[PDB]
Symmetry: C3
Subunit: 318 residues, 3 copies
């Protein structure tokens, strides 16, 4: 009934944006934690659109050092289609990753219906390498380069990506959580003047001021739909250890919930990605449940679960 609680869940069991198998189980483990039931418990109208079937593309030799380009491009193409569908149905898209390369699809699909969207990107990483600046060749470290209009002429024709039209400007994204930024990425960040709150900023200002500044920046001029792309490695590995590229000194669990509580309260969340949960990379069973529980907690905050408490519009003293 509430627009900020009307939800379309898409599972994206995809791993070929990076080397480690296991991230493709993210949707399964999140679902098995009761994600859908818990969403319903807090007065959300929840439709599960299922897990996308990503066809194996067996012939997918690298483009220069960029790995699995056709698989990664196609998986994002399919996802873009599905996110657009969900958005046309009037729902907030909830993408369960899967590796972060999929943001190319998620944001693209979203932007088809709401071209005015603004992006909040929570991550240890900027994920803004181009196919030419990357040294790893892993496409989960490149999705932002593909989306940004200002970088149009710097992205080569990579097989699998001819469908992509960049759909956001440098001014339309804010990073929170940065702490492992490659030199080329830092060059891009400073050159394009992208708004960011690295861990230094968070330390300096506190998460309160960070969120105030993030939302004034994105929404001050006029209201418009928010796309939150949440990489669980933005949180410290003491909260989300079961992930492929952990970096120490991250955002706390509290900081994670603050971010998402504040976004929820704007009323403008329109797209959400919960990315990079890799249950195979927990050192123990408890590391897996710790990671998955944290991801579920972050997601529930996005759709209105508040630490101060929640109540329905009735008189509980009657």
């Amino acid at each position: 009934s509430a627009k900020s609680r009307t939800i379309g869940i898409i599972g994206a069991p995809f791993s070929k944006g990076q080397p480690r198998g296991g991230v493709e189980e993210g949707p399964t483990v999140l679902r098995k934690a009761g994600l859908l039931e818990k969403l319903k418990e807090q007065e959300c109208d929840v439709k599960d659109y299922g897990d996308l079937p990503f066809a194996d593309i067996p012939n997918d030799s690298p483009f220069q050092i960029v790995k699995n380009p056709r698989s990664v491009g196609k998986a994002s193409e399919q996802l873009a289609g599905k996110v657009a569908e969900v958005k046309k149905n009037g729902r907030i898209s909830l993408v369960l990753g899967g590796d972060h390369s999929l943001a190319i699809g998620s944001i693209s699909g979203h932007a088809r219906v709401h071209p005015d969207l603004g992006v909040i990107w929570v991550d240890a990483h900027t994920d803004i390498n181009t196919p030419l600046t990357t040294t790893s060749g892993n496409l989960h470290g490149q999705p932002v380069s593909f989306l940004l209009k200002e970088l149009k002429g710097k992205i080569p024709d990579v097989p699998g990506f001819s469908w992509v039209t960049p759909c956001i400007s440098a001014k339309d994204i804010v990073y929170i959580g940065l702490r492992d930024v490659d030199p080329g990425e830092h060059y891009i960040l400073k050159t394009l003047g992208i708004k960011y709150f690295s861990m230094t900023e968070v330390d300096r200002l506190g998460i309160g001021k960070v969120m105030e500044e993030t939302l004034s920046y994105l929404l001050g001029r006029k209201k418009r739909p928010i796309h939150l792309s949440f990489d669980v490695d933005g949180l410290d590995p003491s909260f989300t250890p079961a992930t492929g590229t952990p970096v120490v000194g991250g955002l706390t669990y509290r900081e994670g919930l603050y971010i998402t509580e504040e976004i929820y309260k704007t009323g403008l969340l329109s797209g959400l990605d919960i990315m990079e949960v890799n249950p195979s990379l927990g050192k123990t069973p408890e590391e897996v449940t710790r990671t998955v529980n944290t991801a579920v907690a972050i997601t529930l905050a996005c759709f209105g679960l508040a630490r101060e408490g929640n109540h329905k519009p009735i008189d509980y003293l009657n």
Copy 2:
């Protein structure tokens, strides 16, 4: 000699406000950690009034779903008597819990001598369910409902509680640490306009501003005695794991000491409860000592132990 260092210790080895055995050992384990000796070491005049003898009340069938009502009511009745005695003797009452239902007794007894008291309630929970809104039936989740004048006509005649007169108004309490609030409790909170700093607030503002706001709110108008009711589950379970209702994302150890340092420095601490330590619920021996050491640290801050250091009024360079 100093009024903020003149202390009356009461042990309240009581568990029937909740289901888990073990909380009744809180006083023993706190004492065995050297609590009394450590208090004396920092220039406190310490009187130990012993552990109250709580008579078994074998016939105590539930009142509707409310469990052990007569035991819980009687234990608080006895405690109220003892706290009043300590207060009449000019001492700061230090109640060693025991489960949080005992706050009914502690605050009631305190209020007999100082009816103008203000309460600071540190906890993951609001503990403000009535006998009618509770879904657990555990009376440690209800003490605030019994104390609040505004809820007088909403508390049924529960066996064991006919001695209770509500002694505080909605304006006379501040919550810090909230992060697991039942819908009915949230309704009560918003309806009565009670001042609270949930973890969201703490994240937003920082503990510094939280304490400034808490003390201006309670003491701005005029000075008056402070009652700090400290549930160790207000701190994150990484600091106080040995407790019955842990909730992740709590106040840090530093935040715990900041709160209590600031209260100590008002000069107005008059009543203290150190509640819900349950040594039986540590997963390991180290979890027990970690919990107990944290509780002792919090208590020592309340009576003047400062992280910057302390010295006696002499010339140490002579």
Copy 3:
């Protein structure tokens, strides 16, 4: 090439300022973690001046209760000589401890070349006991007393220390991280009016304001060289467990990097001590690497490694 990236590394494998063997391995373990290579990777001109050879002084009976005075005095004498040499060569002195008594040498040597230096002292402890106020007799808890001009007439003639001339005034030092301060030390702190940010202050103000205040205080009047004496026990034992005098409730890893990032950005870092790493005191191998990695991270921040990222002056998009 850059003055804030021009470095002279001195190893100070010395332990006799305190009781626990193992701190003398600090330089070895830090070096084995790739400290020198990592410094070079971020465009630093790095000269390794080697580990100082500290001659055993077998006849070194205590001066009253002060232990190993001649060894401690001589080790600092040698270090002062070496730091002065490095400073004359135009380099930032990087001292790898070793116990904190060595700061007597490091700061003394530094002050020979730059008598206007200001000191930032990061530590759980004030390390300002005199030979007469100390109750432990360990000289790593006394270096600041030896350096401070205002305490000249309160330091007895301790064997090994006749070479010392106090070289800083009470106004020339700022403490960050304090949480275990002896009564005599607190007396000295308040008497001399030394600027400090205990953990209470950090909690109150946030590390952002702390660093702003620290740098305005030291540098507002005029620019001058900074000496950062970093005791790894200033960080919480959850980050730097392998150390001789851990104290819970310390500065976070993030807070550690914030401090050092901000100092680096002044352009005025002139002297650095990385002290009290004791690999023998890790409970496990992982506690050792955790400690050493944290120390290396802190050091790299001091010479320009930034969480937001770093890039060379080129066009990475070409």
